[PDB]
Design a protein around this ligand. Structure first.
Ligand SMILES: Cn1cc(S(=O)(=O)NC(=O)Nc2ncc(Br)s2)c2cccc(OCC(N)=O)c21
Ligand SMILES: Cn1cc(S(=O)(=O)NC(=O)Nc2ncc(Br)s2)c2cccc(OCC(N)=O)c21
Ligand SMILES: Cn1cc(S(=O)(=O)NC(=O)Nc2ncc(Br)s2)c2cccc(OCC(N)=O)c21
Ligand SMILES: Cn1cc(S(=O)(=O)NC(=O)Nc2ncc(Br)s2)c2cccc(OCC(N)=O)c21
Lengths: 319, 317, 317, 317
């Protein structure tokens, strides 16, 4: 039987006997992701080049997600990669959920048309205070729903909740997300590692050894493959689909990494664990880091459990 | 003034006072490219999953059929066909088309960027057309380029007049000229290759890569990017500069990429854009193939990076 | 502030504190409407014509399957099926849906406007579900409306809260709310009927039209419009005011339009928008059907025009 | 074998051994028509309604700009511009184009079918271009046609080789040839005119319509259809046979439709399809215009129907 994103979210909400506020959130996000897809694919670009003859793509992305979330009446605190301060929804539009999002990750390399994506995480608000930036300061464990949209060769929405990870394919002919992978689970061990090897000069001693273990296996088994798209959503999804390990580790120059905990690492960490993988900073789980700043960074290693554990074995070996 | 792929080709063909045969060939390719793009973005996938109750095979069918019915071709070589296809006599034209209808599709399970690559030759002589008409060196190319089905769909066309970049506007199904007479940066800051095969690397490749991470002159290291889909990596090299490598080693002494419909069109585009493309031993466009599916090693990109690689390669005798 | 069909339906459903079954019906229907629109605008027609070497049946299959799978329905009535369709036990919900999946499809050869018509009833009896559950008068409708595949694709939804119009944005595949709480003009300037049956017109119909061409008060004559596709004509009536007529004639002594899945939904839209809809003897919404494909005469449109027709009808005893 | 509008036109142009100027003009119109199709179907309307917190003017601008930039024209006459547009010398080509960029757009609020009508003349003298280059009779037309934005989007192209109909596949932004060399029925069963203005009908028009509703013989009355959008009624007339009338009366001694860009392009399609088109006094294509916006009466459609009309017309003369 066919299933859509909207109908699927409605069914799950009906099972749990919820109020519909989260479903109205998820549907609003779905509308915003489709408008980003249409724009990322350059619909109407002929008008920019004068077939008769405006905002830039990350500005438009932020406006779409922001405006769809406010007008969902389901949110109260919004954190975006693009805004210094969390946005507190006006009282007339306030709901109970805190959404942290990256409206367009990978945007640095969109001029070469490589894959980009939207990342989001949803927390129920826990305090009884007036809403503030503080409500966004929850660990990833607290996530109610998380996921990402990947605008690749086709457009897919990957949704993670307690019931598992599900993947939805965008059908541009009808503007519908079609359920194509139910309850996905990552391989126990993979054949690909993903990290920017151009910066090997700054690699932590552990990272140097583990990557050395993948290219020059001690037993002389076959080497792993290397892939690095450079757009976080693309690398993590390939890791989910094919297994393997993705690394953005900390080094001496960047003791807490470069990727952002609230709207890059946590949503991705939440997807990985619900699909049976791991996600660590090296010292602890990403979902266990408690942030003190909504834009603070975290190092992240994620993927198949057997690969992330071998990294931890090597990492431990260097203290 | 606004310009499209279709009008652009007509204007050039009218300039050169040609017969219109290549303009039709290109028009058919472009039509095939919009259909591949439509299917790759999974339009109608809702019917596959029962809303009312293969992709490299389809791409091939689209390109084969649009070229056959263009009446401009006589020999077609595809990654997907073991043997060349000879156009029916009543439909024969004067051109040979080599193509990979959808490269990267083996990893389309992760929605990686994929693309269509093509190169066009004039056939060899008024005899019966044959596979030998496709055994020309890349120097002979009349036109080459690629379609990239990435975050957006772009068609890159290289001819004697240079390299031009056309963006597909899906709202109207038209290719819009957005980059006129493209030229690659003289030097870039990114290198692209699967470092997982380091165990098999040639000394020249090992040394050259060591130079990218650990610069002798103290300058900043290059960044690494490797999508694993040749159209996606090569296009990034064109737009951003840098170097792309799939070199020869001892286990694959002639490489992995295919000479006719992967390497030659991309070297042709590169040279036309001011870049270089080498086998290590010689220019890609100078290899004379003896098999339509033969492979070649390829290093292509910004001239100073390809020249810097060649110095190391020369240095290893 | 922006609003979509889905968000509008959910907000209304949450206001009334319902279970979500009707909302799930509406979402499934909306999905089928977008697939029907895609097919009516001929997406993919190139593959029908061999680029790689019936419409009303698909419309019915899309709706049947999207409604079955909503778990919200138990009896389905389609213009395309002789007998009512009983949903299988594991998929049963409490709603009865009568619909024309593609009305006007007979003249789709000329690219005339076509449309989808639907009415939604809560099942009223506690018996095993059967064809009998669809024989309710239009007064009982919970929701009704239509999709017009015209110059653009618009969905018109009528409920207790009134009539709302949603324009399909094909760039993103979402229905956008563009007209809130729509209400028809009190009196209009256009009449709509197939004047080819004039030889068979009842005297009341002939006279009322004579008043439109030759106004007794010297005012301007009404304009005539008759497209021949009921969704197109009624929507023009809704948007511009005026009157639409499909009266009884000799080949159609009980009228021609179907009461269940054409007249009732349109009557419901009209009344909820402040218009009228009559058979001549009584309101369309008060007719009690005895057969799922039975016909009825219908005069509908602006309230002053329908009342002007009714006075003329009364005068003829 | 599949065929597109672009490939078909190139084939016809290569056959005739023309310069390619008309092919560029025709190819520019096609791109303009698809952009009009995108806007009429309301792509991007969600941005207009604030998702991120003109139509006949845009239609005119798309055609004007695409034709100017085609380098194929020198004089442009539009329903939307008081004076002919003279192309700057560096963009001048040999053709004069007359057009209604969006006919029927007055009633587009109701999502009625709308359309684009065009006629193409070779300029006849070597003088500096002026309005006088557009005052040629329709006999002189080199190509004419219309785009219908109906349930789907179709392009109807008429030339000396005949009339051909192309369906836009929106999935790929391509016009697919679906009806080659179409010819109208010798006689039809539909008449089309605004009968609401019967008070103003010429006595001849009154009688002929009376014969259609009340056939003097045994046959069945004709059916009536009137969309009120000229492109839709004429196209239905072409596809189904019959007659379309916007005739002259005493309040409008020269009719209402404009000769250069409404009546002539439609007369040309009709004659090329084997139909007729008359003002009552003479063939539409024979009128010598003296003003670029002058009006003409027009009766067109199936030949036996127009001849029967002319017999009645002669009777009152
Ligand atoms: C997807 N989803 C949504 C909600 S809810 O609270 O908004 N309730 C609703 O929407 N009810 C509805 N009523 C009518 C309609 Br029609 S939908 C919800 C609650 C718990 C868990 C969920 O997902 C399962 C998971 N794996 O976590 C939920
Ligand atoms: C794009 N292009 C196509 C052809 S051709 O031989 O097919 N002739 C035509 O198309 N004639 C035509 N006549 C009317 C129309 Br309307 S098209 C051609 C020849 C030389 C150089 C070209 O491009 C410049 C370059 N290669 O740098 C050419
Ligand atoms: C639009 N609508 C829908 C329903 S319902 O029963 O399906 N309930 C729901 O959907 N609940 C939901 N819970 C969470 C979500 Br999220 S939706 C409904 C019932 C009565 C009247 C309606 O319309 C009001 C009107 N405008 O007349 C209704
Ligand atoms: C469709 N068409 C177009 C032209 S033309 O002058 O522009 N010539 C060309 O385009 N040549 C070309 N050369 C290369 C390419 Br590739 S096209 C033309 C002339 C006469 C008759 C036509 O149609 C048949 C009919 N009238 O019935 C014509």
């Amino acid at each position: 039987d066919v299933n859509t994103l909207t109908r699927f979210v409605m069914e799950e909400g009906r099972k749990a006997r919820g109020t519909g506020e989260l479903t109205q959130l998820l549907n609003s996000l779905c509308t915003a992701v489709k408008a980003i897809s249409s724009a990322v694919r350059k619909a109407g670009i002929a008008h920019l080049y004068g077939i008769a003859g405006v905002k830039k793509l990350d500005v438009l992305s932020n406006d779409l997600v922001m405006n769809m979330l406010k007008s969902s009446f389901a949110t109260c605190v919004l954190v975006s990669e693009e805004d210094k301060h969390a946005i507190i929804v006006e009282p007339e539009k306030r709901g109970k959920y805190v959404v942290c999002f990256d409206p367009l990750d990978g945007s640095s390399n969109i001029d070469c048309l490589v894959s980009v994506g939207t990342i989001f995480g949803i927390y129920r608000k826990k305090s009884t205070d007036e809403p503030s930036e503080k409500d966004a300061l929850q660990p990833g464990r607290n996530l109610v729903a998380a996921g990402y949209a990947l605008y690749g060769s086709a457009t897919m929405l990957v949704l993670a909740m307690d019931c598992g990870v599900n993947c939805f394919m965008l059908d541009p002919a009808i503007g519908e997300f079609i359920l194509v992978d139910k309850d996905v689970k990552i391989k126990k061990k993979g054949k690909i590692y993903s990290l920017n090897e151009g910066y090997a000069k700054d690699f932590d001693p552990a990272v140097t050894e583990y990557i050395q273990r993948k290219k020059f296996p001690p037993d002389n088994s076959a080497p792993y493959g290397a892939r690095y798209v450079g757009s976080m959503v693309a690398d993590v999804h390939r890791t989910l689909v094919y297994g393997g390990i993705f690394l953005y580790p900390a080094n001496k120059k960047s003791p807490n990494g470069k990727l952002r905990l609230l709207y890059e690492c946590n949503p991705m960490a939440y997807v990985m664990e619900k699909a049976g993988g791991m996600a660590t900073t090296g010292k602890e789980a990403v979902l266990d880091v408690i942030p003190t700043d909504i834009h603070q960074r975290a190092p992240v290693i994620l993927g198949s459990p057997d690969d992330v554990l071998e990294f931890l074995k090597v990492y431990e070996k260097h203290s």
